[model samples]
Target: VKDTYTDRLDDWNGIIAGNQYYDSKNDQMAKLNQELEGKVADSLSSISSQADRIYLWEKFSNYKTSANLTATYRKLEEMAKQVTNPSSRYYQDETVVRTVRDSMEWMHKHVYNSEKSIVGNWWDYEIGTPRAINNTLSLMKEYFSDEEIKKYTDVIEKFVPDPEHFRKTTDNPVKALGGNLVDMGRVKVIAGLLRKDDQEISSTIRSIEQVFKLVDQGEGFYQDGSYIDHTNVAYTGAYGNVLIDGLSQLLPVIQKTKNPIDKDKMQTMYHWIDKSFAPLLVNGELMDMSRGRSISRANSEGHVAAVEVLRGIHRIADMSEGETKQRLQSLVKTIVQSDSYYDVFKNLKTYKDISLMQSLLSDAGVASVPRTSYLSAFNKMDKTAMYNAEKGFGFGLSLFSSRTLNYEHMNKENKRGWYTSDGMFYLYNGDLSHYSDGYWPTVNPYKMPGTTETDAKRADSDTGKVLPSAFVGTSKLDDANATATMDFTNWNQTLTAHKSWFMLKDKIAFLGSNIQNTSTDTAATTIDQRKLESSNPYKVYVNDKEASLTEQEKDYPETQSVFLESSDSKKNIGYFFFKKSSISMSKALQKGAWKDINEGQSDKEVENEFLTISQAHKQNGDSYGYMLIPNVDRATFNQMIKELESSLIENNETLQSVYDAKQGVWGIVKYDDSVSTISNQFQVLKRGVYTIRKEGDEYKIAYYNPETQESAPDQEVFKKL
Candidate 1:
């Protein structure tokens, strides 16, 4: 039994030594070794003997900045690995080991004393520092006296004693669900392993049940695969990655223990890998619409985040078997190959991780999976929608309501993300760099695509307030079609509108009604705002004739249609108006700096060219209708407009409906108790969005109500008519 327990400890020790066994002579490893040694020497030189607990490192002299402390702890952990691992050149070196151990003791006694007042960010105290300290203890325990190990473990316990609650104190409050819960759980498990406490390990492992279950509100994964965090932010792409990474780390440790996690919990995580994560990762890129504030990070782009998620998925796959294992392996292969911008295998540093990926890549039986067509309605997270077309393109609609925030601007990140969730639409195609290539810093926030807004300048860029309406969500009719609706009012109550988008296989049908603006500034609905890749003049066609465009904005009052094709002719986008109204177009160069969005980012000016199409609106009761056809050529665009078998059935303050005559589909969005009669055979009884269609002789109706206050789940019903 003692030997079995030792085996568990050995496994965990190797897990923390992620790249310790890799060739140290490799370029990446050599650079890391130099950094580890150099940083350790700097801390050693700056160590203080003034026992009053004032300063740890004079370079990182600010005591109030919690991040600086966390960084020191993390660097010490890396240095400890140098003396502990045999693959390292400094393995068992007497001087280095003593210096590293003495540094740990001095820092703990002076800086991280448990009785000292907890200040700065709670996360650094609870999650970050404890994680590094516990990991260091696991590696350096054999070299230290039992008394020294006890002191280090005691300090860790003082900070994080449980998985659910914060700091083992009643005053600090419990940790939030999803990523934070998982983070604390991991630290507690490591702490338990170090102390060899069976009770602590087993109870903490069981508490993960709360995180695995489906949640209706607050921070967890919903049934529809939407992950919400920070109480009201849709964060499947950011926090969701953390959640999965934590599970990947925990599962390996748990499997080696005498008390393993429940099989159901493991199964729940596997299901989320497919249902929650698969749709967002399209063609090797995670959709930026779901990233929330992580988008503002200069380093964590869509592809970078997707690579981390891919790594997590691969780790989870190792614990799976049978058909499930095979499927996950194929998914891994697809992402690794499809990611054109980065080399996936070259990025991996650890010997074990690289071995696992190499085995999969070398296997002949595992084939790469192609993209599939699907429509996901994340109704629980204020009605976001993601659509993947058969033509290998991806589309996403980001919505916000009274239940969710418009955007998040916390931690000095995403400072300029004012209108990201205000019915902002995203289109992903062959140009994988569309959003990743400086779009957030360069694009105009007030005039983003698929938004109705005024020229009113906000006092600040952090606009995270929720809109005052609950009628927002999407209804998935089938794999090919869905309807996303939002009855919206600006945060300041200056602008209001009802917006609906009918997502089709090759195009999107958009309708807006009852657009009322009370602000003293001009209001408009932007059709498209995209970054032009080159300085060459962009191609534009109006009414089937090419038009010369310049930096000046052009207005066409009687325009029938407009088309823009890529310079390579591989991608084409067209907009057809329901009525000939005034349209505005522009091509200009915009200059901005990344620091404008994130304070920690670079301040160097970046220039990017952009093209836009917009329609100005009246102060009251203005409406417009248009169809956006993406990835279509001139012939296909003309044919789609000629055979346009769709109707703007109704557009008013009461309701907005559209009839797809070709597909026999009827889409409706009703407000309050307003007129809801769609036809003699169909009527909407609730304030929601609905879609009706026919297959064979039976009529199928689907509805979604975003109003969570109502108790009755069924918002609408139907009978044979």
Candidate 2:
């Protein structure tokens, strides 16, 4: 059982080493190496610790250790030497190399002893055993002369078929999914390079085939063409986007392969970048609606990732043209033009304010610690403009060039939501709060089939419900009144008693008497009749004559009479509704009647009465709210009425027949110079149920028989004497 377990382990190691070979051949190894270099460059100045430096160095070393190329090995050796000597030519330029070498030396001194045994024997002592052996092998291969290589080869003759040590190291249970695959691929590349002469190149090819078979069996690629584990995660973007990055890097290497099938496989991997990944833009912004994550469109990291993707695609398409080129250009334009992209940077600007700082630092994982002041200044500018001003204009120009200004359909759902177009933001949800708060003027009331009432205080309920309220009218009567008059001047004491009324025809009327007090030095006070009007027109008569009255005078005495009839028999005279007072105004008026008695009370009295009457009538419901009928402004009202009448005539057959029968009485004829007056050029359409037959220029309309639906020239719809 022990021998069987050992053999199974050996076979597994061999398979893993084979995968690393194939992955390196495809340039996956080289691409990861390039990324590690870039990350080291980016982090070197900020990174303080030798520990993180070692971590990145380890990643770089893994790529170097796995590579088969002699040139790659020479470069690695040169970088490794830079770490050993501070005064080396490449020392300053290769900080990553120094960090890796120092960390390896540290590990060798403290963790492992000369006989390849671990002195510490930590918690995972067994797991480190394979890695220690692998490192020792790398050290021997790198440092040993040709004689030392032969000596070690003989020392390990018994374990010659034991399989590569790096593959065995990957068997550790703690290996993560992505790290495990990467390590497996790495080990295969190292094993293939080591056995290049001992094992035929065909053996390396077979090993690669087996590694891919494992990947296939694992079902790594999902049905949607994304990796299986990343389908619904936020990391899907990270993984998928990275995979494309890898494919782009590997394209050149894949093209160089002479094998047609292998080359095809590499080309097929890039199709996802072109097609499956294209729909990420909606409204000129990246779609970051991830499932089961707090990260959203508001996330700055996500926005950064989007920017990276755009930048990557732009870099790739720099050499290409036509449709693929156009797509990349459009995507890059959208990434820069998106509002969220601007918002993220703007949030970073106000990073000191609690709300803004929390949003930027916490949500975006951006550190709040002060760094470059230039970045701070740039952030401030970004906040005010809501864009990275330096990069924004080019993006804006591209979008504007493609935009069209024609009318587009607004569906019901879109009509209910807010939409921005042509620099106007339309809020379609009609809560009316914004408008009522004075953001906008009150809209005019819409017309329904009844009398419409309007008050400055009362907003039109329907106007706030839907757009394009159909109630707008162009008539002058619909306009609000500018001025109103009071009915009494000196009759101010009794002004409240007089009433005012508004006519349906938009006229103001009042019913009240204008009376004035007159005094003479020798005598008593008297009330004089100034002006009077009847409440109802039926109670009064108007003519060319005036009435006279006589009354006794006292301290305060009055006489009054209703002008029941017109004084002139030939012309109609006006009458007044009579009301008497204690003061005798008739004698005083007679005294003052000789002079022109212009008391200026008539207008005031009439105005006051009109107001009072209208108020009372409104309270009693004896009044109807007046609305000016809507009139077509561009066209004459009469013309509109005529068009409606014509439509009605065409629609109603009964009316048409009626008109035909009455054509003789209702219609008139005109001569046409093209045809003789007596010719059959005239035809009767329809009139008052009448249809006329014309034998000559003179055509007639006559009443038609209702039952027969026929018309005769002699027939009349109405009786004519």
Candidate 3:
């Protein structure tokens, strides 16, 4: 029994240490020592001074400051790792050991004790503090007595009586789901190991099994591959990471025990990776549209999140067999090689992860998987379209309906995310650092791309505003094209508009109609707002003539065509006007700080150049239509304009339609409740989105009912030509 228990412990340690982490053992040792030396000195000083006897740092003395308490636990965990690690210089060092032990005793007695009040965020008490302390105890178990370990485990058991409900209120109907439940199960697993309690381990495994199943709504993986957490926020790139990390940690060792998870649950998890996670990885990063508030954090970008997912995939693959295992291995290779932005090996902290990656990369049997074009309509999560084009261009359309929250603003994160989901759009290209490289803080939040807005001032960091409209969804034909529609109204009710995107192969036709601004300020639609790539030469042309833009915003009235070209031919973009219209353009150096969006981030000023294009609507019920061609060259842009086959068929309160004759595609959005006409030849029966294409004289129509977040029922039909 002891031998089996030790095997579990060894696996846990391996997760912490990494296999052949010794390949970079010196660098790891150096990093551990540098941090350990600073932590030990500071901790010992605090112990000697005893200014705040209850806490190591004076700032973290209050028991109610749970985040700070968790930080202290993490600090102690760091010290313990260095002292216990054989590769570390501080290994078995008497002074380092004493310092770690002293800090642990103090934390257990004062901060995370049974008598302490749980006044702050419930997560810190239930998951954060316990997780850090469990890792600490696991490392320092040899140094502490059995009674000491039991004393610490007792506090955890007291707070987290079960792996599901909250400790604060028993009647709280909401049970833990998604990442939160997985985190609780992890705490229980480590606690069971410390006490060698088989019953506790098996019970927690059952609780965690719930997360493996699909969710119809709220805080889990939806059948459409959408993940939501914090109730109504799209968080596949954030909380999804947590869910995968916890499950990956628990599955390996638990599989060796009597209470191994069922095979069905394992299959469900694999499906989640395929549906919810795989398609989002475009150009080596998860698209940021579904990441929620994590976009505000400077360190947690798409590529960074992608690397974490890579580690999770490797762990789960070890437990899988045959084709499933091989596919996972190939996916690991794909993500690893695709990421040119970061050094993958340097980012992986665990020894087992490093070992798995090293072996997988060396194996000739495993081949890198090619990323294909896909357009997923995650209507359940209120993301109308997440489209990845074959040319490595990606577009994400974020929307908020009556069913979903506009954005998540909590813990002083994403304060200016007010307009993120109001038909906010994301465009990704060869410019890998477009959004990740200081874009969020420096860019204007109100006038974001693909959003219609008024100058009505909005307060920062407030949430819980659901729009009255539910007509937000996408209709896609096959994989190459999609049409996303949003009958949008700003949260404050100051502006309303119907926006649609005809996502074709090489270009997008944008149509906006029924725009009514009730506010005293001007209303406008932003075409694109992007960080200026300094390495590339920037030039703007209006009516086939160069117009140098300055810091001040300038309106080019009655512009037939506005084209932007860069020295790098692939960086060129063309904005073609259906009719002469007023186009606003600007090039300016904007200065801001990350702390403006997230309070925890640095307030130090950073500056970046930006280019913005928009169309102002001064009159009520004003409408606009245009074309956007990204990644095009001058010769192609000129030739395409002469032979342009795409046109705006209609733009009004009742309908917004576009057709690409060259591709033989018709993208139509019906906004009214009754039968809406695309033309005399075709009419949609109700309020929905439809995409049509001819396959050998047969018109294949893909329709969606946004209200149901599903395919329009068979009874819902349309008159065809």
lDDT of each: 0.75, 0.25, 0.77
| Local accuracy of candidate 2 as per-residue lDDT tens digits, 479-585 | 11111111111111211111111111111111221212231111111111122122221122112123233344222222221122312221111111122223222
Model 3 lowest lDDT segment of ten: 17-26
C-alpha lDDT of residue 669 in model 3: 84
Which model is ahead, 2 or 3, in terms of lDDT?
3
The local distance difference test score of model 3 is 0.77
Q: Which ten residues in a row have the lowest lDDT in candidate 1?
A: 709-718
Candidate 2: lDDT over CA atoms? Answer: 0.25
Which runs in model 1 stand beyond 4 Å of their true positions?
1-6, 19-59, 84-95, 167-172, 345-349, 461-463, 535-538, 567-570, 672-687, 708-721
Best by lDDT: 3
lDDT (10s digit) by residue, model 1, range 1-721: 2355446656766665654456666555555556656766666566654553366566566757777677777777876777775666567888667766876877777678677656777787888888888777777767776567667778767777666677454364765578887887667777787777787788777776677898876889988888998888888898888888777867788877877777876678876887788888866788887788888876777887887678788888888887888789899998787777666654453455665677788788888877567777877775444545456677888789888898898777888688788888888766777787777789998898999999887655445998787878887778767777888887678999999887756678788999999888898999989877773335789888988776899988887799987764335678888667688888888888888888768998888888888999965999878888777778888888876634667878877777766777878777765546665555667677777786667777777666753322333444444
Residue pairs in clash, model 1: none
Best by TM-score: 3
Tell me how many clashing residue pairs each candidate has.
0, 64, 6
lDDT of 2 at 336: 46
Tell me the lDDT of model 2 at 340: 33
